Structure formats: structure tokens, C-alpha cells
Design a binder for this molecule. Structure first.
Ligand SMILES: Nc1ncnc2c1ncn2[C@@H]1O[C@H](COP(=O)(O)OP(=O)(O)OP(=O)(O)O)[C@@H](O)[C@H]1O
Ligand SMILES: Nc1ncnc2c1ncn2[C@@H]1O[C@H](COP(=O)(O)OP(=O)(O)OP(=O)(O)O)[C@@H](O)[C@H]1O
Ligand SMILES: Nc1ncnc2c1ncn2[C@@H]1O[C@H](COP(=O)(O)OP(=O)(O)OP(=O)(O)O)[C@@H](O)[C@H]1O
Ligand SMILES: Nc1ncnc2c1ncn2[C@@H]1O[C@H](COP(=O)(O)OP(=O)(O)OP(=O)(O)O)[C@@H](O)[C@H]1O
Ligand SMILES: Nc1ncnc2c1ncn2[C@@H]1O[C@H](COP(=O)(O)OP(=O)(O)OP(=O)(O)O)[C@@H](O)[C@H]1O
Ligand SMILES: [Ca+2]
Ligand SMILES: [Ca+2]
Ligand SMILES: [Ca+2]
Ligand SMILES: [Ca+2]
Ligand SMILES: [Ca+2]
Lengths: 358, 117, 358, 318, 346, 358
């Protein structure tokens, strides 16, 4: 009867139990059908046509989402939803209509006893032990700057950037084309993504690192392919994530993440800006690059009042910040009053989900 | 080693149950995540700090409570009050005692030009 | 507490009950009896169809009133009625038949050893430390001016106004409509009652307050509903209770409370008017608004002989002035002789009330 | 507002509303009555300007007096306050009544014992009943004197200003009241967690219950309490038995309550409801009852104003 | 330069820094502290011995916290119904003896209340030397309704020593008092149904428990486990004429304006070491429930860290940016004197 | 009817029978295959490429772990698994997932009739004869401070350090490089480890010991290498393990083991710290260095309150404290009721572990 925590990302579902220090289950967020009914997660990945029912953080395909959830309960976590309060997560600026659908599904389709939905970036902040700060949440499909004061996200200052993890993978495949390594297929992309996650880091000074790559090499590193073949990588290590500071790299016209962070803060009430500067929390897989902390520190220092207190919080577990946040929250005796119960739903219908809050 | 076994066995039945122990603030709550008792705590703390920072600016004035009859009106000092109120009620009930005792009959009024025959 | 006297204040809306000598009633609950859509008080509030057995201060449903008293004794106070002399309150100008009926039931149904019946207003006066004055008693269902000399209410001078707290709640509901808020359900009527109670107030100068409001703002207040929504309220704060002074606001032909105050004084013997003007006591829940005393001061000021002493007495305990007055009276050595005994009742019958309660 | 409790041995002064007198200091007053008007005015002037440090024209002032104070004292003290010190208002109240007030009561019987006089005062609904009031001149200073006399046996001599202070101090530090004096005597002579000084610890205050110890044939304090009760209407007695309050420095002895409970038990019909009230602060019960009353809003109308005095004279006090 | 926080109890000083999760230091309040381990300046919650108390504080700054007082604004705690006298003197000492740059005095109970995330409710605070019921409303203790009971933790230890005497276990000395106190802390609990628990001991026994003494030997304890704290509900156990803590809570609520009673019943918070017994929470409810109007919502709240509720409340309060303007400053004290504490601390 | 004990470490498996004085079998926790199936422990020593199925104390390779367990039962201990209730050990803060998988493999593949899992550190504490104490377990891959109150590990105050024994061997290899002694190969690493265990110690005062090495030398010791050559070793003797107190020696940024101990104790309830200080128990191969007890006592007394009683317990056999502890537990009468039975597993699944083992 322990509550379930389910973080639906554009790329990865993260699921598990309240109490737990990390998501018990983590699988690709995809539904496949022959190009017997439908294959979910990894089943589909191994002949099939693939859909991501979540784009840039938003559920855009309800029937496939429904199928994702059934897999999550019954195949991954192996639980009967009726016996479990369930907390879901949502993207910043999710339309109120979604969360209502999302609720209705849980109650009428999964007959959960109770459920909750919380904002992704909020949970991440929570997992940093704070109620106030500005989150940079970057997953596979979207990046947000989300200022939060007292557990309230500040929607007028929220920044969304469609550039995230997948885009970085795809760009790495294109710059790997430079050394003339060929990657296209299912199998091939997976390798590139692993390379990204294992070898890429953020250059503290990109142009200095480039003028240096064009020189020495403690730079270049090797990597073994499945068949035994060994490959070598150079400036691609820091050029790939540099895209986050220079989106022009994939032909995106948008401003870089440091700039969007600043602009977000500046779209907040001036009184609280000090507190935002002092609490810049990162979460999501795309924030996992070594050195990112210090590069952001630098970029933010370059833009702020020169005497401003600047702190970057990058917890080592920030890969699962969101989820962990959920777990902690669903665990609290104080939170138990905040479940939406089946009975409440019945008498008030889906609109009830918006109510309560901390 | 036969002996290490006995002390143990007498010490494992000397034990309180974890329920009791978190009940005494020795244990953190089983079921909260065990890494992240720190942040969990931090967070509960902030949560409270915030409630405080608010409920404080919303702090009423002594005046106002007394307007609502929360506090007694109005001097003297914390400790005196308690009794002082006993005295308020005492002094008054007595002040009322004779007042009713020596209450004019209806005739007094009627003749005093108030009320009908 | 073996033989302690009991005090029961039967208002149209709320029953106030306890033991003589206390500062405050032991119990306060709604004056209702319910059956499925019998249960009493808060019991009935928690599925049922209800009656209020007291209308405008007068008992109108006798069977149900008995159930009110039974609940008081056995559920609320938890006592043996036979062990306890009992003081009751009644409205000004309660018809003689009601007094007798009430007496009879106390002695015959509940086998009380002794009882007494007092006027709501006089008790309020007593609690203020007076036997001579004019009381304005305004509860939930009815409002009275009661001029009182040495504890004798003057029937020829009494004013009754059916406009009260209930009516103010209703009107507030109505005017809240202007900001476009619908409050309609029984449960919503409660919320508005709460709003009334917390944020309404009596303007010193109504016209001025209107012209002011449009400008300043101390004025506008926001209020959070049960369901998490925030409403905002403005001149309704003071337009609500203005009604007491201008009953035309709800279409009533009566003159306002200040005017009935003045008129009641004028129906009293000329020589006692100074004493009345200088002892104007307010009692009953509805007399609670911030500013009310000052407004009455200034309105009676403008009505009187320019040379008269004007004093408004409005104690913080005025909600329960009636009950506290009861507590103190029954507790007096002098009063001990004034009880009606069962022996006296058996020898004379119900009509004993007229010669004993005055 | 200011509160001044003029006792025989200690003047108690402060502000209405405080816990305790802000100033307690040392005769212009004998057996509770002002007898030395020269030194009285010096002690009052000292109180305002040296002790409390206030300008008297700016403070309403409540004074205390012994039960049964000659009405002329109240008048002269009224005259001195309004004319010498120019107070804007004033009031005079009964020491014993104030003490009962400090317990939150207006009906009871008070035993007030300070430095110079002891009274039994039955009070019904605020009114001291003059016909039943008892006076005994045996009090605090006198118990100090008798301790000086019994310490004569152990061969310690105390006589001077300075020496009487040491004895007063010892009295206040180590004396207690025995529940059973004879058993206590028989026991001291035996065991002893008693000795610290031995039987003088309880023999000194024993004088209150047996005035023969300093040569009085007078009734003891338990008896005078009872006699005072018996001088009251029979129908008000049960109330007085149920509310026996002790006040003044000299009632401060540990166990005094317990002993009096036994003694009064022996005087009443055996079914009678008996209660002895002994607050830890009864040293200042009088002052505190004054602080209380002067702090009450209901009392503000009850001051004698400068204007009322000017128009009516010192006799307005009655 | 972090602000300092100091809870002065009859038994223990609890001291530390604003923003800490609990006190950096705890030591006995005797003359200093643990020096006297290898006079009590506070009795029944009230500082009565100013010189020793000054020594207490001195120890605190210099031996315990190791801070220069002039560099740290300081918050103190006080008992409910503290005389105005005490407040002022305590203020004077801090500014004049210790030369603090700023300070505040907060009531113990209220700090505990805040700590629980409330600003209104009714506290039961029971430490070593005094027990109180303190109804509080938006931070305002309601003085006429405050209830005081002299029976506390110390008395309970002493009574445990006395009843273990019946089993013919002798505890008498200084060091024996200490053993018994540990036994109390470790093995005592509150019976849901006392009469029944007595009837139970006398029969079964999951009841009896064993405790190993410093000298090696083992003693076995039964009804003393629950008879010790039973005193709190039955003070006649130690010959006190007082009604029990359940009763005083009822009486306390009943002394408050009827319009806030429901909130008090619903917010009955426990704090202080002597509220630490297993079962106490549940028992209270039982008893309160039986007394109150039967429709009443009764909640007893007992946070596990309530031993230090008060200190923690202090840590938090001083940590608030809102509070920084509420300090009494050196400047202000110089300009108004010690009576400034009544206009600034309430 | 005869229990078995298996303590699974990063470096070593410790295994034997309950009521045994010591594990009958200790061998390296590794699985190998050519650089005829698979070679476990010393079989892999005899050419091959390796996995350690446990990294830093936690099970990371289930397949290979299973081959470890098979070897233990059939090659080393030579029993039939099915016939022996089996106690397993785990790292502190072992993911809930792991305890379950471990449980499952036990019941399903090895058909144990019953089993249990306790936490390494608690076993060691029990082998010390205590239920309350803070343990320092240092093995081959990981080091922990684990406070434990009345049997229960205190999760919030647990400290982990990724420095341990394997690190120290490696470091000694590197610092022997200074005197120009050449150590790199598999065979050579073994030689170095021998020297480590035989010659190294913890200087009670490091700087002084350094400055003494530099002078005299009772300090320098000779060691005959397996090839007949003799070497001499000096300050390397204490410099090697000094790393545990100064991890900076290998560029690790973490605090030292005494600092962590202090911090761990300060993470616990103030009222029990006294009790932790005075019951500080050491365990694991890496606490085997002479004089480490002494060093530890000094460092801690320095850090704690001066009145604080500090006591280090370091029992001679603390090399196997965990195993021995298990043997004691397994052998308890009181414990026989606490095994997880095959029946109970069938009915409740792997998750039963959470209710039975803590
Ligand atoms: N160490 C790492 N370094 C860089 N990128 C990583 C690392 N680990 C994971 N990622 C990338 O992060 C992305 C997944 O992050 P996350 O789970 O936060 O996204 P999501 O929640 O599925 O998507 P979103 O929140 O955008 O909907 C993947 O593209 C993955 O390659
Ligand atoms: N603070 C407040 N401000 C305004 N109105 C209030 C307040 N508190 C209570 N009331 C109103 O008081 C009324 C109840 O008061 P009261 O108990 O005197 O009525 P009652 O005695 O039951 O009725 P009646 O005397 O008319 O028979 C309700 O209408 C309530 O809304
Ligand atoms: N603890 C104590 N035990 C016994 N006697 C005490 C104690 N403390 C003070 N006294 C005595 O009480 C006397 C002073 O008390 P108090 O101030 O009540 O007298 P007073 O009001 O000056 O005199 P009076 O009321 O008789 O005119 C002194 O004799 C003093 O020694
Ligand atoms: N676990 C426990 N069970 C029972 N009593 C305990 C426990 N822990 C501490 N105590 C008792 O609590 C008391 C100390 O608590 P605390 O620090 O609240 O008192 P204090 O603040 O110094 O005293 P006070 O508030 O009475 O002035 C001691 O009597 C101690 O034995
Ligand atoms: N006398 C000794 N002195 C120093 N180190 C030793 C000694 N004996 C063994 N060791 C080291 O202890 C380590 C193994 O200890 P242990 O078996 O406790 O580790 P483990 O349990 O395999 O690892 P972990 O508990 O870290 O998962 C090895 O690095 C070994 O060289
Ligand atoms: Ca996400
Ligand atoms: Ca009414
Ligand atoms: Ca006196
Ligand atoms: Ca305390
Ligand atoms: Ca190990």
C-alpha cells in the first residue's frame, strides 16, 4: 500500500516507491507497433513504429500515455494501482486541462485510491531541501528556468527552451560525422548517447579550450564499440554541451541557458532576486556534465550586480532530482492530507486537482 | 564464544521498538527516504520558517485581541491578571447583590410616572 | 457541582448553556432539530432536513424545543436535571402563555427542583453592572431596544425589529454578487457568514466611506475560500452592516437601529431619559462589528437634545452578554430567595411564573 | 498610578500593575496607625523623590491603613497628600481587605500580621465588619524581641540596632511552626535534624498561639480568629471558615498553615468546612491587593480627585 | 557573528546558534554546570538567583559556545507569567554585563508552538521543575488562562527512587539518583488505562523489564514503569492536592474565550522532556476526550524532538529576516533602558 | 538444521557455518574469463579478464554474484544449499531493490529453506558485544561510519567514503616508486599488499614520525621479496595508511576518517552522542593497522568536547568481525524465530525482507 511515484519525462519514465532513495524503474517513454498489440519501453526498442507520447514535457498522446501507465504499474513496478496512492509529475506550464485528464485517467481508468501530480522543477527544488530558488531543469526533451518562491512556481518568469538531451545526442552524431564515424540506426544512436554521458564535460572557457584542443592533448579519449573496435574523440567532448550556451550550434536562434536564467530572474519581483541568485538549483539528466557548475557560476557572475551572492546547487543525484523530490514528499505525514481521494474526485470531479498546494 | 552469545541474547530483548525510537526522536521516520533525512529536514524547516515569516507580519496588536475578548482588559501584568479577573467578577457580583436586593416594587415605578395601572 | 444552578440562553440561532458562576458558557451550538433528507445541534449539521424551533427570539416549535433542552442536559452539559435549579432566558414581550408553557415543561418533563425565567436584554444589562439602562439586543433572528429601570423592562417602550444577523448574512450574499461571486448553497451561506464576521464593519459616515473607498485602500481585503480560491471584498465590508442603520437596504420599512434607540427612549418617562442616554448598552452577536459603537455614538448624538449625556457601552463579551448576565444573577445570595421551587409549582401551577418572574 | 502600604516597620511602595512593590524599606507608624506626622511627611517625601523618583502631581496615589484606623488619620493623610504633595487624585484602603483581594476574594476572614500589629478581619462582600475585628499587639518585631530573650539561654546577647537585625534575619531564615508543639519539644530533645539553634526555631513563633510566652494572658491567634467568627452573624460563618486567609510578613513561617488547620479544627463544630489560605507572597498581599485594585478600570471612577477634595475637604475620605 | 539562542530551564540550559537544527550545547543549571558534576539559580522556571544565573550565562558564552558576546545578538527564553522585574533584569544583564549588540526575550511555550508550525494553540510544557498549560493566540500567551503545576521531571525521578524502594532496591545517593533518572527515561511509559494496567502486572507479564546496573548486576522492574509517570495524572501520588495534567489542560482551555476553544482543542502541543513518555499522547487524548464537549475535535500533537521544542523555536525565530528588525538594539536600550523589553518583547 | 554465514565484500567473501569461530573460507570476490565457463575466486588467479561483482560494498553484477554464491556453496563450503538456513550480509544503506534481489536469488535459485540479511556494520558491533555504538567498517573498496542505536542502524547519520584498502595498496605501489622500487604487475601488486599488511602502521603523530624517519630509524625494516632479493622500507610504513586521515594524499577531496566519525556522531541525537563516543568500534581488514586505535583515540578526543569520554574498541579479529558477528547471531535461540522461511517467501515475495530484516 505504499504510494507510487511516477516521473514522466519526454525521454525516460522514472518510477518507484515513496520512501525509496531513487526510482526503482527507469525506461524509455515510447510505444511501438509493428511497422502483439503494442510494445512498451524496451520491448519496442529491440520491426516496430515508435511514438513518444510526451513531447517537450507535455503529454500529447492520451491513448499511448494510457498504455505507458499500464506498463508502468503492471510490468515495471508490478503493482495494482487500486492499492496505491499515486503521485505523478507534470511539466511547468502544463495546461489545466491536462492535469484534469491525467487525473480522470488515474481515477476512472486505474481506480487509484488517491493521487497527486506535482510540478517537476518544484520537486527538484524540494529535493534540494529548499522552498525558494530558481531551477534549471533540463531533461531529454525540454529545458526550463523555473523560479520558485515559497513553493510557488513563478509562471510569468518561467523560461522554456526546446533544446535538451536528445538534441545534444543528435548533434554529437553530426559532429562525429567530422571524424567520419558513421552512426544512424537504433543500435548506433545508443552508442553515441553512451559516449556523450561518459566522456562529455563543460569547458570553463570554451574558446580557450578550442585554442588548446587545436594544440595539445590530454584532450583526446578512447572508447570501445561492442564488436571490439576502438574509437577516439577530441573537442567534441565539450563542443557538444557548449550548444546549451550557444544554441546557434544546432541552428537555434534562442539565447543560451545562462542568459535565459538571468532573464528569468529579471522577470521576477526585484525584492526576491537576491534569494534567487543565492539558490540556483540544477536537475535533470542534461545537467550531469562535469564542470557545468563552475561554468554556470562564471556566466551568472558575468551578468549579475557585481556584488551579488551567487550559488549554483548541483546535487550529484540531480539525474533523479525530480523523482526523489516526489519520494520524499509522498513520504511526509504532513503531505497525507493532500492526496486527492477517490471519494473527493467523485463528488468534485477532475477540477479538484488544482486545489491545496504545499 | 558461548558467552558472546548470551550477553547478546540478553541485550536484544532489552531493545525498544523502532516505532518507539523515532517516537523519541532517535530514529528518523522509517518510510521517509533514508538518504535525504537532511534535505527532508531542511525542507520541513523552511516550510515552517516561511509560515512563520507570514503569520508574523499578520500579527495582531495586543489591543485587537482584547477587542475580541481574547485577553483580559487591560492592565495590569501577566501574573496579576489571572486573580484580578477573579476579583473583577467578585467585586461586580457583590455590587449587584444589594442592587437587586433593594429593588423597587412595581408600585414604586407606576407612581413614579412609568408603567400603567 | 452537585446542585449548581444552570443557565440556558435560547437564541433564535444559538443555544448558549453552562453553569452559574463560570465566566463563559460551557457549550454553544446551533438551535436546530433535524430528520432525514431526531438530531440536535452540531449533530444535525453533520444529511438531514432541519427546523429552527425559535423564530425571532420566540419559541415556536414546542416538541422540538424540548428536544433542544434534552440535548442540552444529557448530551451537552451531561447532568441530572432533578439535581439542578435552572435559569432560562426569553425574549422581551414573550407572551404570557409561552412563559407558562416553558415553566410547566421544566418542572413536569425534566423534574427540575427549581427554575427562573429572565429577559435576554435584562441579563445583558446586569452583566455590564447596571439595573437601569436601554439595551440594544441583536442576535441572529431579531433585534430589540429594551429600556430597563431597576431591572424592569418597560413594555410600552420596547422596539422589535425583525432585521438581524441572519439577514445581514443574506444581504451580504446578495451584494457579493456584484463582483460576480455566487454563494448560494447552505454551505456557501456559512462561508459568507464567516466573511461577514471577519471583515465587515460599520462606517462612521456612510456617504463619506463610499466616496473614500473609491480612492484609498485600506479598503479592499482578500479572503481565501475552503477550496483554495481567493475572493476580494470592498465596500461590501461596510455596506453589509450599514443595513442595520438603513433597513431600506433590504427593503424594510422600519427606521434604522439608531432611530429605534432614540424612539424607545422617547417612549419612556421624561425624567429617566438622561439615565437611558448615558447607559446605552449593546448586546448580541450582531453588535460585534468594528466601528459600531462609534457610529451609534455619533448617530444618537445627532438625534438627542444637544445637551444630553451620551454613552455607548459595548463590552468585548457582548456576544454572550445574555448568558454571562444569567451566570452572575443565579449566583447572587440575594437571588437565592427568588427561585421558583417545585413545591411552589405544585401548589400554584404554571401561572406562578407571572408573579415570580418580573 | 502609585501604591503605598504604610506598615509599622516596612513601608511598601510601587506602581499599580506590577508584581511587587518596587521599593521596601524601614517609627512614624505605631501598631499600624500614623502617630508621628513630622516623620510621616519625611517618609512620604522620601518615598516619592528618593525611592520611586516621580513628580507627585502626575500620579494618582492609593494609600493603606490599619483596620479600625481613626477617621481623622484618613483625613490628615488625605490633607497631606492633596495639599503637601499635590496629587491629582487618591484613595485610602484597609490593609487586610487588600490582602483578601490579592487572593481574588471579597468574602472571608483575614489574619494580618506585620511588624507592629496583628488583626482578625471578617469581610463580607468587600465590607470589613467593624464589630468583629480583633486586634493583638504581638507581631514581627515582637517575635524578634522574644527570640533575643530565648537566645539568652544559649548565652548569646543581642540588644543594639545592628544586633536586632541579625536576630530578625535568623528568625526569618530558620524559624518554623510545630504542628504538635509538645511532641516537637519531646522530639528535639531526642533526635535532631532539628538543630541548625534548636527548639527556639519553633518556640519563637509558638508565642502567637500561646501569648503567655511573653507574659500575655491573651487568647492565641487561632482563638481570636474563632472569636472574630463568633462575633459575626451565624448565617455568614460557614463562608468565613471556608476562607481563612493569612497576610503580612509575620505569617511567613513554614508549616503555619498546617498548624492553624489543626487548631481551628479544634474550635469549630466537627463537620465544618475549613480552609486556610497561605500564598507564598503573603508578605506583600496588602500591596499586591492594592496594585490589583488600582489597576482595575472599574476603580478609576472611585478615586478622590483633587477637584473633589478642594470642594469637599479632608472629610470627603469617609 | 551568528545570533545566539538560550533556553533557560530549571534543570538544563539548552544553548546554540540560530539556524542550527538543535542546541549546540546542553548542561545542568547548577553552581558551574558540568564543573559541579565531576545551588540551582532557576526554580520552577523562574530565575531566583541572579549571581549564579550570571555565572550560568558566563559559562554558556565562554565555556560552552566560545563566543564573544558583543559579536552576537542574543535571544533568551522565559517562563510564562515571568514577572516584569525578571524580564528587565535579564535584559540589563545582557546589555550591561555581557554588552550584547542586540537581544530578545521570548516565552518558552510560544517558541515551542512556533516550532510545531502553529501560532495558536495550547501548549503543555513540562521540564524538570515546572509544568504549565499555556494557551497562546497568534503568539500571545493568554495570561488569565495559564495553569501552573509544580510537579515535574525531577519529582518523577524522586518518586521512582521511592517506589523502587518497595522492591527493596536501594537508591539514595547522588549517583544513584542518576541511575534512577536513566531508568525513568528508558523504561517508563504512560498506561492507557491505569487501573487495568495495575490489574495486568499482578497477573501476566510482558510487563516486567530488566535493567543492567553499572556494577554488572541486573534488577527487574514492573508496575513502577507506569506508576512513575501516572503521577502526572494523579498528583496525590506524591501527596499534592493538585488535579492532574489532563485536568489542568481542560481547565486552561475553559478559561479562554469560547470563540477560540475549538482551535485550542485542535492544537494541543506537547513540549519539554517530561512529555517524552511513550503512551502520553494517547492517554491525554483519552482523558481530554472524556472531559470535553462531545462534538469536539481534539488533537494532541507531540513532535519527537519536543525535548528541545523550545530551543528549536528560538533557533528558528531568530533565523527569520522578518525578525531582524524586532531585536532590541544597543542603541535602543541606551535610549529607553530595561523597560524597553515590555514594548519590544510580547 | 545447521545455519551458514556468508559476508560478501568488495574484495573478499567470508563464509562458514554458524557457531564457528571463523569463516572456514575466505577468497577474493571476483569472476573471470579468457582475456571452461567461468572462474571464481582463486580459480581466476591462475590469463583472464575480471569483474568484481561488488563495487564499493554494493552488489552491481547479479549474474556474476550468483556464480560467487554457487562457488561458495559447492566449492568452498561443500554443502547442499537447500539444507541450510543462510545468513547474508549487506552494506549499510543497501538499496531496497538489492536486499530484495538477493533474497529472491536465494530462495529461487539456491532453494534455501530459510534466510536473513543483516547489515555488515551491525554484525561487527554485535561481535563487539554491544547493541549501541558507532562502527567504522573499512574494507577493500569502502569505508563507513555507522551509528547504531539498540540494534538499529541510523540512516541519516551514516557516512560513506570511497577510499579504502584497495586504494591503499595502490598508493603504496605508487610511493614505493619513489625509492625507485618498481611495482605494477598483477604479481607485483600482491607483493605490495603483503608488505602493506605486514609492515605498515599508523603513526600516532604523523609529522613527528616523518621527521623521525628522516633521522634515525628504528623505523626502517627489511623485507625479503619472493624472488630472494631484500628491500628496505621506511616512512612508507606509516605514510601509506596515513592516507585514511589525509585522503588528500591521493587527491581525494573528502575529509579524513576521524572527521567523518566526528561528523557522523554530531549527526545523531544529542542525548546519545555520549554513548557513541564511548563505543566506537572498528572493523574490517583495513582497520588492522597497528596503532590506528591510538591515533583514532587522539584525533577524536581533540575534536570532541573535552569532558567527553572516548573509547575505541578494536578487537583483534576485527578482520572478520562481521562474519563472526553473523555466526553469533545465526546461532541465537531468540533468532530462530526471525529467519525468513521458504513458506513466508512464497506467500509474500522478495519484499518480505523489509518487514523481517532490520
Ligand atoms: N551523465 C550524463 N551526462 C549528460 N547527459 C546525460 C547524463 N545522463 C543522462 N543524460 C541525458 O539526459 C537525458 C534524460 O534526462 P531526464 O530523464 O531528466 O529527461 P526526461 O525527464 O525524460 O525529459 P524531460 O524532463 O526533458 O521531459 C537523456 O538525453 C540522457 O542522454
Ligand atoms: N464578529 C461578528 N460580527 C458580526 N456578526 C456576528 C459576529 N459574531 C456573531 N455574529 C452574528 O451573531 C449572530 C448570533 O448572535 P446571538 O448568539 O446573539 O444570536 P441568538 O441569541 O441566537 O439570536 P437572537 O438573540 O436573535 O434570538 C449570528 O447572526 C452571527 O452571524
Ligand atoms: N520569612 C519570614 N518569617 C517570619 N517573619 C518574617 C519573614 N519575613 C519578614 N518577616 C517579618 O515581617 C515583618 C515585616 O512585615 P510587614 O511588612 O507585613 O509588616 P508591616 O506591614 O510593616 O506592619 P503592620 O502591618 O503590622 O503595620 C518584620 O517583622 C519581618 O521580620
Ligand atoms: N525520555 C525521557 N522520558 C522522561 N523524562 C525525560 C526524558 N528525557 C528527559 N526527561 C526529563 O525531562 C526533564 C528535563 O527537560 P527540560 O530540558 O524540558 O526541563 P527544563 O527546561 O530545564 O525545566 P523547566 O522547563 O521545568 O524549567 C528532566 O526531568 C528529565 O529527566
Ligand atoms: N593486517 C592488515 N593490515 C592492513 N590491511 C589489511 C590487513 N588485512 C587485510 N587488509 C586489507 O583489508 C581489505 C579487505 O578487508 P575486508 O574483507 O573487510 O574488505 P571487504 O569486506 O572485502 O570490502 P568492503 O567491506 O569494503 O566491501 C583488503 O584490502 C586487505 O588487503
Ligand atoms: Ca523530466
Ligand atoms: Ca439572544
Ligand atoms: Ca501590614
Ligand atoms: Ca524549559
Ligand atoms: Ca566487508
Amino acid at each position: 500500500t505504499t504510494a507510487l511515484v511516477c516521473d514522466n519525462g519526454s525521454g525516460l519514465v522514472k518510477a518507484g516507491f515513496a520512501g525509496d532513495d531513487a526510482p526503482r524503474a527507469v525506461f524509455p517513454s515510447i510505444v511501438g507497433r509493428p511497422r502483439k498489440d503494442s510494445y512498451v519501453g524496451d520491448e519496442a526498442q529491440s520491426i516496430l513504429t515508435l511514438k513518444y507520447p510526451i513531447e517537450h514535457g507535455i503529454i500529447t498522446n492520451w491513448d499511448d500515455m494510457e498504455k505507458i501507465w499500464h506498463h508502468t504499474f503492471y510490468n515495471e513496478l508490478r503493482v495494482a494501482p487500486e492499492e496505491h496512492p499515486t503521485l505523478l509529475t507534470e511539466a511547468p506550464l502544463n495546461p489545466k486541462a491536462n492535469r484534469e485528464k491525467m487525473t480522470q485517467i488515474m481515477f476512472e481508468t486505474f481506480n487509484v485510491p488517491a493521487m497527486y501530480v506535482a510540478i517537476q522543477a518544484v520537486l527538484s527544488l524540494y529535493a534540494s531541501g529548499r522552498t525558494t530558488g530558481i531551477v534549471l531543469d533540463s531533461g531529454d526533451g525540454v529545458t526550463h528556468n523555473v523560479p520558485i518562491y515559497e513553493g510557488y512556481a513563478l509562471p510569468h518568469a518561467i523560461m522554456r527552451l526546446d533544446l535538451a538531451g536528445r538534441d545534444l545526442t543528435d548533434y554529437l552524431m553530426k559532429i562525429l560525422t567530422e571524424r567520419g564515424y558513421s552512426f544512424v540506426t537504433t543500435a548506433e544512436r545508443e552508442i553515441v548517447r553512451d559516449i556523450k554521458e561518459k566522456l562529455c564535460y563543460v569547458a570553463l572557457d570554451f574558446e580557450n579550450e578550442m585554442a588548446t584542443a587545436a594544440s595539445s592533448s590530454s584532450l583526446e579519449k578512447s572508447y570501445e564499440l561492442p564488436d571490439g573496435q576502438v574509437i577516439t574523440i577530441g573537442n567534441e567532448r565539450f563542443r557538444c554541451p557548449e550548444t546549451l550556451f550557444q544554441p546557434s550550434f544546432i541552428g537555434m536562434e534562442s539565447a543560451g541557458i545562462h542568459e535565459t536564467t538571468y532573464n528569468s530572474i529579471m522577470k521576477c519581483d526585484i525584492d526576491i532576486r537576491k534569494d534567487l541568485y543565492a539558490n540556483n538549483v540544477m536537475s535533470g539528466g542534461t545537467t550531469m556534465y562535469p564542470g557545468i557548475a563552475d561554468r554556470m557560476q562564471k556566466e551568472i557572475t558575468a551578468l549579475a550586480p557585481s556584488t551579488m551572492k551567487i550559488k549554483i546547487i548541483a546535487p550529484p543525484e540531480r539525474k533523479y532530482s525530480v523523482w526523489i523530490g516526489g519520494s520524499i514528499l509522498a513520504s511526509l505525514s504532513t503531505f497525507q492530507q493532500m492526496w486527492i481521494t477517490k471519494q473527493e474526485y467523485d463528488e468534485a470531479g477532475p477540477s479538484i486537482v488544482h486545489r491545496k498546494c504545499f | 564464544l558461548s558467552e558472546r552469545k548470551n550477553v547478546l541474547q540478553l541485550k536484544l530483548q532489552q531493545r525498544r521498538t523502532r516505532e518507539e525510537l523515532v517516537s523519541q526522536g532517535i530514529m528518523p521516520p522509517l518510510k521517509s527516504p533514508a538518504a535525504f533525512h537532511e534535505q527532508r529536514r531542511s525542507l520541513e524547516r523552511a516550510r515552517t520558517e516561511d509560515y512563520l515569516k507570514r503569520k508574523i507580519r499578520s500579527r495582531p496588536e495586543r489591543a485587537e485581541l482584547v477587542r475580541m475578548h481574547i485577553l483580559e482588559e487591560t492592565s495590569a501584568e501577566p501574573s496579576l491578571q489571572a486573580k484580578q479577573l477573579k476579583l473583577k467578577r467578585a467585586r461586580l457580583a457583590d455590587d449587584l447583590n444589594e442592587k437587586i436586593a433593594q429593588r423597587p416594587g412595581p408600585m414604586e415605578l407606576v407612581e413614579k410616572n412609568i408603567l400603567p395601572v
